[PDB]
C-alpha cells in the first residue's frame, strides 16, 4: 500500500506518536498501551495501534534524519489519514537555558538542509508546529507539573557536525538543542495541511559535555512519554 | 541618542507596541493611552509613552521593510532597554478564505530576504515569536471573543511581488498573509534575546484586489489595538 | 490612488528629487523652491511639487532600506509617471579615497540584499544608474566647482552590520561608501525603464571614525541640494 | 560504544557491505555467509560478520537518506576501522539505458542535498567512488557474466519528489536512476580517506512504471549480492 | 615572466586594447598601427606594441570567457603595469531595438558566473567600468559621428545559453547584449585599482536571428576599432 | 560552419584529442599525427586531422577555463559529430599523494563554477568521465609502465585563486590537483551523450611550490601524449 508501511487503511488512529527508534516505539506499546498490536514492520520500522486511558492512539517509527522522517510522515498523512503527529525524542542541548532531563517544545525548526528551499521557492520557509497542538502541550505540561522549555531547535543533516564553532551563535538565536528531524516533520505537516509537534528530551548537553546515565535516560524518557500520551487522550 | 530615536533613556516602558506607520502610532496614542507623551520624532517617526489601565506602555513607529524595521527594534532593545515588542501592522491576504480586516497572529515568518542567511550561517533560520507572548495573545483574544487566525506569514522585500504565481504554494504551506517586517522583528529579537510577536490585520487582498485606504489603515483596526493593549496589561 | 501616496494624478513633475528623511524633503521645499506645494503625506512620508529657476521639480521622501525605497519609486513611476529620479542622502564612507563633505556619484550599487536575484534569474544583476543622468551630474558638478567622487556604493540591508570586517574588502573593489537604498532605486528604475542616479554626501567616515558636526551637516547637505537642483534645472 | 552501533572492537571486518534495509542484511547473513554472527542491533539496525569462501566479510544496515547513511559510514570508518564499503541497494530507474534486474555502478552521485556544499566550501563537490573498487566491480561482473550498467545516480533528499518534471533532464545527463544515499556515502568515504562504491539494483523504473515480480526481485538482487561478495573476496 | 605572457617588463604601454580573438588583435596591428612589434605569443595569444598616428598603445588577446579574460587582465595589471584596459569585442543582441553592427558601451556587466560571489563576500558585486573612460568613449563617439548605444551587458558563462526564455527579462532590465568576458574584466579591474571599459559590436541577434562569419571581423567592424584608438589618445 | 570553428563537417574524426594550448596541439600534429592536415584556425585555435597507427584521429585546442572549453566541445559534438573527447593538459598539485611528472586521471571534477548549477536544477551535478574511456586509460597506462594516479580534480574559474587557504580541505576530499576545464568538458559531454576523459600532468606543486623547468614540462607532457594516443588507436 506504500513502499515503507505495510499496514492496511484504517489501522492508524488519526493521532500518531512518532519516534526515530523502532525499539522505543515497541517499548511504548507493551508498557503504556492496552490492546496494542503491531500494524506495520517494513524494514523493521515498527508501528502500532492501541489504547491509552480508553482512547485510540497509533505509534510509528521513522528512522533518523529529515529524509527518513519525511518519507513516513508523508505516507501517514496522504495514505493513512493521520491528522495529528507528535514526535518525541532526544537531542543535544546547546543553550545554557536548558540542562539535563529538561523537555523542549520546538516552536521553530531551523535547519542546514536544502529540503525546505527545494519545497518553497528557494526562500526561507519558517518551519513551525501547529499552534493549537503546542497549546495542548503547554497546558498538559502544566497539569502534569512539567516546566516546558520553549524555543527553537536546529534540525541538522549532520550528527557529527562540521560547525561546532557555530553552536554559541545558534544558542544566541534561541536554539535550545540540536536534533535531526523537526524541520522535515514541520515542513511535511505544513505541505499536507496536517498538525505536527516535536518534543525534545535533553539526554545530552553538548556545551557542558555532560550526559545522562542509561538509567536516568529511561526515567527521563518515561516522563516525556506520559506527556505525549496525556495530550492525545 | 541613536541616529534614529530622539528619546532620553528611560522614556520607553519595557513593553512597546510597534507600527510601521507613524500616524497609526499617533492615533493609538490619542485614542487609547492616558498621559501620552511624545518621546521621539526623528524622520517624523514618532514614539510615545503613556498608560493603559494603569500600566506603562510605549509605542514606536518602525517604517516599511525588514531593513527599516531592524533599525528601530535593534535600537529599542540595545539602547532603550525595551524587553517585549508587539508589532500590530497590515498585511495582504493570499487565500480567498482569509477575509479582509481579519487579525492574524504570526507563529512564524518566512521570508525572501537574505538577512537571516547573512545573520545565521547561510542556513535556514526559522523566524518565530516568543511563545509566552503568543500564548498571551491567543488567551486574550479568546477572553475578548475577537477570533484570531494563527499561522505563518511571508515577509517580503517586495510590496509589488514578482512572484504572484507562487501565492498558492505559500497558502498551501500555511502562510496566511504577506507583510514586510515580521522576519526582521523576529530575527532581531532572537539575536538580542528579547520577546517579540507580530499581529497584523488584513488590509489588502492580493487575489481579489480589494483595498483599503491610506486613512482607513490608520483607523479601522481598533480590535487589533485593544487586543494588543489588553495583552500588555 | 496607490496605498502609500495620496497625491492626485499629475501632481508630480516628471523629474523628482528623493531623500530617505521626509524632514529634509520638507526642508528642501521650504528653503529652495518656488510655489512649493505639499502633494502627499501618507505615513508622514512627505512629498512636494514646486519650481526651481522657472522649472518644475518634485520632491519625495522614501524612508530607509531597499524595500521601502522600492515601494515609493515603483509607485512614483508606474502611477504618477515620474521619469527621472535623483536621490540624495548621507552615507558612511568606507574608502581612503573619500573624506568628509565629499559628494559621491554612485555608478554602481552592490548589495547584500536578495532582491535583485529575486528580480533577475538568481544571477548577479549589476545595478547601475542612467548614463545620461550621471553625465549631467558630472558636468554640473564640474561647472559648480564641486570635486565629484565617482565609484560604487554598497547598498546594505543592515545599518548595524554583522560584517564590519569586510569593509576593507569592499573599498578594495571600489566601494566608496555604504548606504541602504541605491541598489533598489537602480534596480527599480531598470525594471521600469526610468532614469535614476544616486548622490551621497560623506557625513561620517566609518574607518577613520571622523565625522561632521550638525552645522557642517546642514551645509554640506545644502551643497548637494544645489547640485541636484542645478542638474534638474 | 557509539550512539548507533553496539558491536565490540574488532567485530567488523575491514570489508563491509551496506544496505538501507536491516531485513536484507539479515537475509544476506543467512543465505550467503558461513557462521555469520549478529554483532550490532541498536535501533533494530542490524550488522553481522561472517565468511564467504573462507574470507571475512561484515554487513551493516544504514537506514534511509544521506543523513542516516553518513552516521553509519562515519562510525564504521572512524570507530570500527572499516576500509572498504560496498553499498548494495535498490533505486528508481529513470534512463532507457537500464531495464529492471539491471545492476548499476554509480560512478558519480549528484544530489539536491546541501550536505556537500556544507562540507566543501559551498562549491560543487563531485562525489565519486574509489576507482579501484569500481574496477574490481567491473572485472568481477565480467567473470560472473553480469552486464554492469555504469553511470551517475541522483541521490535525493526526497522519495516523493517535488521535481518529477526534471527526470528527463536528469537522465539526459547520464543519471541512470534515483536513490537516497550514494552522495552521502561517497562524500564520507572521501572525507575520511576510505574506499567506497555503490551498486544499485533496478527495482522500479519511474519512466516505464514497470515494476517486476517480488520473486524476480530476490533472484536479481541475489546477483548483486553475489557480485558484491565475489569482489570482497 | 608570467605563465601566459611572453613579454619583457616595459614592453606594454600603460594603455591597452583587448580582444578575445588574437587574430583581430593582429588585424588591428597591421591595419591601424605603425612600428608595430609583436611582444607576446604564448598559446598563440598575440599581443602587440605600436603607434596609432604617432601615439603609443598596446593590444592584447584575452581568449573567451570570464576565467580566460581574468588571467590575462590580472597579469597585465600586476606584472606589466597596464593602467587603462579598453576591451573591444563582439556580442549577441537580445532585442529588436539593437542592430547587428551597433556599438554598445557596457556601463554594467551582470553575469551568471559565480566568480564575483567568490570574490565578493557571496554578495552582489555590481561590476562597472571606470567612469572617466566611459565619458571619453561617450565624447569620442559624439565627436566622430559614431552612435553609441549605452546600457548593461550580460556576461555569460554560456555561448549556447540554457535560458533563452529569459532574454526578454534581460532586455527589460536594460541589458542590450550578451557577451562572455566583461564582468571578469570589470571585477578584475576593480580588484586591482585599474581603469577598464568594455565596448561591444553586435555580430549576432539572438532573438531576431542573423549570424556573422568568422571571417567578417573587418570594416565590419573597424568603426569600433577607430573609436577605441581615438579615445585612447 | 560555426562561429569558432571553420572546418568542414567531416573534417573531424569521431575521436578527438584536446588541449588548452593550440601550440601544444600543433606540436602533437607534427610529431605524432600521420598525414596531419590543419582543419581549422578561427581565433588561432588550431585543430588537425590525421592518422595514428592507422586510426583516424583529430586534435583540437579549446583554450582556458570552463566557458572556453564548453564552447568548443559543444561545437565538436553537435556540428562535427565527435563522440569521444580525451583531454590532456597540466595541473597544479594540491595533494601529498602526487608529485611532479605524475599523470592524474580525473574520475570527478568538482568546481567553483556556477555553470553546472545553471545547467542542472541548481543542484549538485557530479561531473564524471565516461567509465569505459577511463578503463582504457587505466589499462593503457599499465601497458606503458605509467603509474596512473586517479582521483578528483578541482576545476576553478580562477588561475589566481582567492581561496588558497582551502587547498588542504580539497586534498582531504581526494582532489589531487587544480586545473580549469575538466568540469566543463565532463558536463558538456554528459549533456550531449558523448564520452569524455581528462588527464593532467603535474607541472607545479601548489603546496610545496616545486615546479618543472620548461625542458621537464615538455618531456613530461610527451609521456601523457603517448598515453593519450595509445588509448585512442
Curated annotation (Swiss-Prot), chains A, B, C, D, E, F:
Active site: 204 (proton donor)
CDD domains found in the cross-reference section: PNP_EcPNPI-like (cd09006)
Important for catalytic activity (site feature) positions: 217
EC nos: 2.4.2.1
Cellular compartments per GO CC: cytosol
InterPro entries: DeoD-type, Nucleoside_phosphorylase_CS, Nucleoside_phosphorylase_d, Nucleoside_phosphorylase_sf
Record-linked Gene3D superfamilies: Nucleoside phosphorylase domain (3.40.50.1580)
Binding site for phosphate: 20, 24, 43, 87-90
One BP term from GO: purine nucleoside catabolic process
Gene Ontology molecular-function annotations: purine-nucleoside phosphorylase activity
The keyword Glycosyltransferase is assigned to this record: yes
Chain positions recorded as a purine D-ribonucleoside binding sites: 4, 179-181, 203-204
Catalytic activity as recorded in UniProt: a purine D-ribonucleoside + phosphate = a purine nucleobase + alpha-D-ribose 1-phosphate; a purine 2'-deoxy-D-ribonucleoside + phosphate = a purine nucleobase + 2-deoxy-alpha-D-ribose 1-phosphate
Coiled coil, from the record: none
Pfam families associated with the record: PNP_UDP_1
Keywords assigned: Glycosyltransferase, Transferase
Self-association and partners: Homohexamer; trimer of homodimers.
Family: Belongs to the PNP/UDP phosphorylase family.
Role of this protein: Catalyzes the reversible phosphorolytic breakdown of the N-glycosidic bond in the beta-(deoxy)ribonucleoside molecules, with the formation of the corresponding free purine bases and pentose-1-phosphate.
NCBIfam families in the cross-refs: deoD, PRK05819.1
Protein name: Purine nucleoside phosphorylase DeoD-type
Source organism of the structure: Helicobacter pylori (strain ATCC 700392 / 26695) (Campylobacter pylori)
Phylogenetic placement of the source organism: Bacteria, Pseudomonadati, Campylobacterota, Epsilonproteobacteria, Campylobacterales
Gene this protein is translated from: deoD
Amino acid at each position: 500500500m506504500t513502499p515503507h508501511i505495510n499496514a492496511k487503511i484504517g489501522d492508524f488512529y488519526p493521532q500518531c506518536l512518532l519516534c526515530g527508534d523502532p525499539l522505543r516505539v515497541s517499548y511504548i506499546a507493551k508498557k503504556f498501551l492496552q490492546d496494542a498490536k503491531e500494524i506495520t514492520n517494513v524494514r523493521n520500522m515498527l508501528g502500532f495501534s492501541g489504547k491509552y486511558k480508553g482512547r485510540g492512539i497509533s505509534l510509528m517509527g521513522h528512522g533518523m534524519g529529515i529524509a527518513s522522517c519525511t518519507i513516513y510522515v508523508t505516507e501517514l498523512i496522504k495514505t493513512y489519514q493521520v491528522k495529528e503527529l507528535l514526535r518525541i525524542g532526544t537531542c543535544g542541548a546547546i543553550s545554557p537555558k536548558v540542562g539535563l532531563k529538561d523537555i523542549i517544545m520546538a516552536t521553530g525548526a531551523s535547519t542546514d538542509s536544502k529540503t525546505n528551499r527545494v519545497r518553497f521557492l528557494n526562500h526561507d520557509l519558517s518551519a513551525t508546529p501547529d499552534f493549537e497542538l503546542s497549546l495542548r502541550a503547554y497546558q498538559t505540561a502544566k497539569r502534569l507539573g512539567i516546566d516546558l522549555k520553549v524555543g527553537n531547535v536546529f534540525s541538522s543533516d549532520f550528527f557529527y557536525s562540521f560547525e561546532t564553532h557555530a553552536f554559541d551563535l545558534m544558542a544566541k538565536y534561541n536554539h535550545l538543542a540540536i536534533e535531526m528531524e523537526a524541520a522535515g516533520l514541520y515542513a511535511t505537516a505544513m505541505e499536507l495541511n496536517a498538525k505536527a509537534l516535536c518534543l525534545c528530551s535533553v539526554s545530552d548537553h553538548l556545551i557542558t559535555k555532560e550526559a545522562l546515565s542509561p538509567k536516568e535516560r529511561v526515567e527521563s524518557f518515561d516522563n516525556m512519554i506520559i506527556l505525549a500520551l496525556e495530550m492525545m487522550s
